[PDB]
């Protein structure tokens, strides 16, 4: 049958209480199989299922480093959205990124995802073509313009059609955001 991998990245700015809390959870099919927390005593990716504990320490070391880098990716874009909406830097705000892929019985890609939400409302999302974007408001339309100009959609498209399919096939044995300034919010 068909399968699905899905990651959820949430960053919540706590003004005066330190740098925003970063959390990343993963879902193979529809089971939470991995999880990262920045407020943990030893912040790293953790296996949330017994069948992921078989992975070597090299694997966990690699995927953790991405999250710690993604944590830096979100703190920067939180500053941007703070200015885009003309909000004060003394309030709490949340930036969310959802991505993953649906596959078929063949094993090939069926649908890729790349969605961004701010304060619980939709912002910008990758279309089914994996080439165009759908913006929610005017501020996101400003974001889409530079993303179509830089071709940020082709960054994720290689992931969704690539290792996202491959990593899903791997976990069934029973990545991050671009750092091009124009490809940012």
């Amino acid at each position, epitope marked *: 049958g068909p399968h699905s991998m899905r990651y959820f990245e949430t960053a919540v700015s706590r003004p005066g209480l330190g740098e925003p809390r970063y959390i990343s959870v993963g879902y193979v099919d529809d089971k939470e199989f991995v999880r990262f927390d920045s407020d943990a005593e030893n912040p790293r990716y953790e296996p949330q299922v017994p069948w992921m504990e078989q992975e070597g320490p090299e694997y966990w*070391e690699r995927i953790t*480093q991405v999250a*710690k*880098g993604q*944590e*830096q990716w979100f703190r920067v874009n939180l500053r941007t959205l703070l200015g885009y909406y003309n909000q004060s830097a003394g309030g709490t705000h949340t930036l969310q990124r959802m991505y993953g892929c649906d596959v078929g019985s063949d094993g090939r890609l069926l649908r890729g995802y790349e969605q961004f939400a701010y304060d619980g409302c939709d912002y910008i999302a990758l279309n089914e073509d994996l080439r165009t974007w759908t913006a929610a408001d005017m501020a996101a339309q400003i974001t889409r313009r*530079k993303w179509e*100009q*830089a*071709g*940020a959609a*082709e*960054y994720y*498209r*290689a992931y969704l059609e690539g290792e996202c399919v491959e990593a899903l096939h791997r976990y069934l044995k029973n*990545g*991050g955001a*671009p*750092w*091009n*300034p*124009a*490809m940012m919010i």
Partner: T-cell receptor, first 110, second 110 residues
Framework: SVTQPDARVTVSEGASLQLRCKYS??????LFWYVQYPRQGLQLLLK??????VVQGVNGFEAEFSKSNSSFHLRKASVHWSDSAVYFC??????????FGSGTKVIVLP | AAVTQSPRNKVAVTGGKVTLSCNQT?????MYWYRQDTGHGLRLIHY???????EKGDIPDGYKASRPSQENFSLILELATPSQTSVYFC?????????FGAGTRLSVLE
């Protein structure tokens, strides 16, 4: 991945200089050109991430980006003898850190 | 520049403890440690996102990193090997662009 296929370039003075740099990425990465004059640190010539694919730099150096060719070639119409140095092509995309090419030493012959 | 390394020259010994230090005055959150070897250009060893942060580079084996403050990023060679004989560069990482230091020549002999 980043490749500077020419490790060495020997040119006559006043001629044209073309330093070659290709990158192995599915999308436009943050590109840089650093120069290392003999017994000196690294100095930035130019960079690109969006906008005009042709970027001007100091010392009469211009670099052209080609998404099709996936290259960031560094060109100069008339090279001086003082330009004899080593040029590095850097790249950033997946991480906020720069991955470097193997560098190219240029030797202007007077 | 506003990025300084100490020492600039160090004669080490196989098995000895070597510590490279890099201070900055730019408030750049990111700091980097590279080494240069002919035929390989510039390779990444360790970097940092801020005070207390330590991230592995492309070739971290043999080296240890330390970020005690925003300004200081240190490289620690506990067991010095002749393979660690190279020229080392430090950097500050405000945004995507990088600002290098004058570099440090390290030789490890038997």
């Amino acid at each position: 991945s980043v490749t500077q296929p020419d490790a060495r370039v020997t040119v006559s003075e006043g001629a044209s200089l073309q330093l070659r740099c290709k990158y192995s990425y599915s999308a436009t990465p943050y590109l840089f050109w650093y120069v290392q004059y003999p017994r000196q640190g690294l100095q930035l010539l130019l960079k690109y991430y969006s906008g005009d694919p042709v970027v001007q730099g100091v010392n009469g150096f211009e670099a052209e980006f080609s998404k099709s060719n996936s290259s960031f070639h560094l060109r100069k119409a008339s090279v001086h003898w003082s330009d004899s140095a080593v040029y590095f092509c850097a790249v950033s995309l997946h991480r906020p850190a720069l991955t470097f090419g193997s560098g190219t030493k240029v030797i202007v012959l007077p | 520049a506003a990025v300084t390394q100490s020492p600039r020259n160090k004669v080490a010994v196989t098995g000895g403890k070597v510590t490279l230090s890099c201070n900055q005055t730019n408030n750049h959150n990111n700091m980097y440690w590279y080494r240069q070897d002919t035929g390989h250009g510039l390779r990444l060893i360790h970097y940092s996102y801020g005070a207390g942060s330590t991230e592995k580079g492309d070739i971290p084996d043999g080296y240890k990193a330390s970020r005690p403050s925003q300004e200081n990023f240190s490289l620690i060679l506990e067991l010095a090997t002749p393979s660690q004989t190279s020229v080392y560069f430090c950097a500050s990482g405000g945004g995507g662009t990088l600002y290098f230091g004058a570099g440090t020549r390290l030789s490890v002999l038997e």
